[PDB]
Design a protein around this ligand. Structure first.
Ligand SMILES: *[C@@H]1O[C@H](CO)[C@@H](O[C@@H]2O[C@H](CO)[C@@H](O)[C@H](O)[C@H]2NC(C)=O)[C@H](O)[C@H]1NC(C)=O
Ligand SMILES: *[C@@H]1O[C@H](CO)[C@@H](O[C@@H]2O[C@H](CO)[C@@H](O)[C@H](O)[C@H]2NC(C)=O)[C@H](O)[C@H]1NC(C)=O
Ligand SMILES: *[C@@H]1O[C@H](CO)[C@@H](O)[C@H](O)[C@H]1NC(C)=O
Ligand SMILES: *[C@@H]1O[C@H](CO)[C@@H](O)[C@H](O)[C@H]1NC(C)=O
Ligand SMILES: *[C@@H]1O[C@H](CO)[C@@H](O)[C@H](O)[C@H]1NC(C)=O
Ligand SMILES: *[C@@H]1O[C@H](CO)[C@@H](O)[C@H](O)[C@H]1NC(C)=O
Lengths: 282, 117, 112
């Protein structure tokens, strides 16, 4: 049972620059002191990435501003989030996000992650509902509150869970019937922007889902310190978490491989003529 | 033991606001929630709502939603209730209560009784 | 909103007699997620501020041991005394904690 959190449909999203982000290891082979050219669905350098702010707005403005819209999935998406206290917890992928078609549910409680692809009738605004208490000063159990019905399940997988301080990055890609996740976790300290630096994502898992993926919606966990059974959707706060979504595109890259096998630099071969001449000169 | 200190009996004119004070010892109001209560022998006792000192906001009941306001300040261990203007319905006994999260009301003061000429 | 009814209105029994009071609700009190019944019971004397008796049917709290024993259902709720005691002149109420407002029952009185 889910009670609609917000009446406002949308707010005008503002975009930031993804400076040299979202580079993932193309293959599982080791290379040292090697400049390597590889073609894949990479995220274009200096692109436009939508900036989402799920934070509590000041009391003068309307009481609710947190946003979790159903966003398109276009040949893979790039996802980042700068947060503390694990506000973001899971994502939902699927075509219609309703009962007739299958969809992928990937939700991660701090101790564990559940990855189920099953027909799901979804709530408009799905959220994991945590509660907190004042006398004990401890944080308590949660309520899932993400789907009304689950039927015809075909794959279950459970594994170890995968200012601002934490910067988590994920790249999702569906190719040839497999769903592949690339991840990287990096402590940072710039509060409101993507860092100016290079980080390489490592292959976490590839799954044999075999489902059509057209749209995805992020899952945020919300906290309220009082619970009554007959009244909900009143008193939820989003804390302070921001997530960023970019879109992948078929592009050619040239990668600098370090002595110890790390990826330290890469070049977009279509940014400008200078980048193209660097890509061809290698 | 927890005990509460409450406004004494009041005799007032209609057509004007009224203020109440509910006091606590042994804890900070931030630690809990605060309910308010008005009681009538005939027509029974009524439930007003809860105010959160930590939130800075308050969720009221619907019967009392009109003609009611709640305020709190942590500097003193005191919570306050006020009404827009005194009607015959408001000419009643009043109580304040403390509500634990995920729980019931646990503390009730001596009370306050409003009689009107 | 939830509405509460109480019975008996008033009953007179000798000290040591067994007495039972029952209050009935028009909606369910069970909450599936916790499987917990959000109901409490109160006892009050004239001119004494109402004080909570232990909720969730676990009525046992500090005081004289097992003063009053209670039983509840999804829609029905009863309180029992195995032997009426002379000191415990009491008036009782039934309240619910499922949705606003927390209902107050019609009241129950016990006379000796
Ligand atoms: C998904 O699971 C439901 C479980 O109810 C299946 O519904 C049953 O379908 C069978 C025939 O396949 C009927 O005999 C039953 O009466 C149905 N049960 C109901 C409607 O409660 C449904 O077929 C499954 N879908 C699949 C396997 O594609
Ligand atoms: C994957 O799902 C999408 C969306 O459901 C499909 O795109 C639709 O396909 C139908 C049938 O061809 C068209 O009528 C629609 O106009 C398409 N777009 C939308 C937004 O519905 C797509 O065909 C599916 N992929 C495969 C391989 O079946
Ligand atoms: C809000 O949720 C209710 C619950 O059933 C639903 O009926 C209603 O359509 C929702 N409001 C929307 C979708 O705007
Ligand atoms: C992103 O698009 C907006 C217009 O929607 C534009 O103003 C902004 O400069 C773009 N960001 C780039 C090109 O980095
Ligand atoms: C995760 O752990 C919780 C207990 O903390 C358990 O209830 C849940 O079923 C687990 N989910 C899995 C299998 O990942
Ligand atoms: C946590 O708070 C609840 C409030 O209902 C209380 O019952 C419980 O004893 C508390 N636990 C601890 C460890 O303080």
């Amino acid at each position: 049972q889910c009670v609609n959190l917000t009446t406002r449909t949308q707010l005008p999203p503002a975009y930031t620059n993804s400076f040299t982000r979202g580079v993932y290891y193309p293959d599982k082979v080791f290379r040292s002191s090697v400049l390597h050219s590889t073609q894949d669905l990479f995220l274009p350098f200096f692109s436009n990435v939508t900036w989402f702010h799920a934070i509590h707005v000041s009391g003068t403005n309307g009481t609710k501003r947190f946003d979790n819209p159903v966003l398109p999935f276009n040949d893979g998406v790039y996802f980042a989030s700068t947060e503390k206290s694990n506000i973001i917890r899971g994502w939902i992928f699927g075509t219609t996000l309703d009962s007739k078609t299958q969809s992928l549910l990937i939700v991660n409680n701090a101790t564990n992650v559940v990855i189920k692809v099953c027909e799901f009738q979804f709530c408009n605004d799905p959220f994991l509902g945590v509660y907190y208490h004042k006398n004990n000063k401890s944080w308590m159990e949660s309520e899932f509150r993400v789907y009304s019905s689950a039927n015809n399940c075909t794959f279950e997988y459970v594994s170890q869970p995968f200012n601002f301080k934490n910067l988590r990055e994920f790249v999702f890609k569906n190719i040839d019937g497999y769903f592949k996740i690339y991840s990287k976790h990096t402590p940072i300290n710039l509060v409101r922007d993507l860092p100016q630096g290079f980080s390489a994502l490592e292959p976490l898992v590839d799954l044999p889902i075999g489902i059509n993926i057209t749209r995805f919606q992020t899952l945020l966990a919300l906290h309220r310190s009082y619970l009554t059974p007959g009244d909900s959707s009143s008193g939820w706060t989003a804390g302070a978490a921001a997530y960023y979504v970019g879109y992948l595109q078929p592009r050619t890259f040239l990668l600098k491989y370090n002595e110890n096998g790390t990826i330290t630099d890469a070049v977009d071969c279509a940014l400008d003529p200078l980048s193209e001449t660097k890509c061809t000169l290698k | 033991e927890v005990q509460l200190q409450q406004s004494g009996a009041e005799l007032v004119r209609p057509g004007a606001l009224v203020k109440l004070s509910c006091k606590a010892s042994g804890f900070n109001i931030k630690d809990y929630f605060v309910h308010w209560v008005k009681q009538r022998p005939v027509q029974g006792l009524e439930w007003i709502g809860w105010i959160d000192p930590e939130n800075g906001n308050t969720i009221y009941g619907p019967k009392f939603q009109g003609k009611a306001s709640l305020a709190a300040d942590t500097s003193s261990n005191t919570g306050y209730l006020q009404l827009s203007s005194l009607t015959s319905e408001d000419t009643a006994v009043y109580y304040c209560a403390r509500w634990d999260g995920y729980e019931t009301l646990d503390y009730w003061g001596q009370g306050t009784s409003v009689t009107v000429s | 909103d939830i509405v509460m009814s109480q019975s008996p209105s008033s009953l007179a029994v000798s000290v040591g007699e067994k007495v039972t009071m029952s209050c009935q609700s028009s909606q369910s009190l069970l909450y599936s997620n916790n499987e917990k019944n959000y109901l409490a019971w109160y006892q009050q004397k004239p001119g004494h501020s109402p004080k909570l008796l232990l909720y969730w049917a676990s009525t046992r709290e500090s005081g004289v041991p097992d003063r009053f024993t209670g039983s509840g259902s999804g829609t029905a709720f009863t309180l029992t005394i195995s032997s009426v005691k002379a000191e415990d002149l009491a008036v009782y109420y039934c309240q619910q904690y499922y949705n606003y407002p927390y209902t107050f029952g019609g009241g129950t009185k016990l006379e000796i």
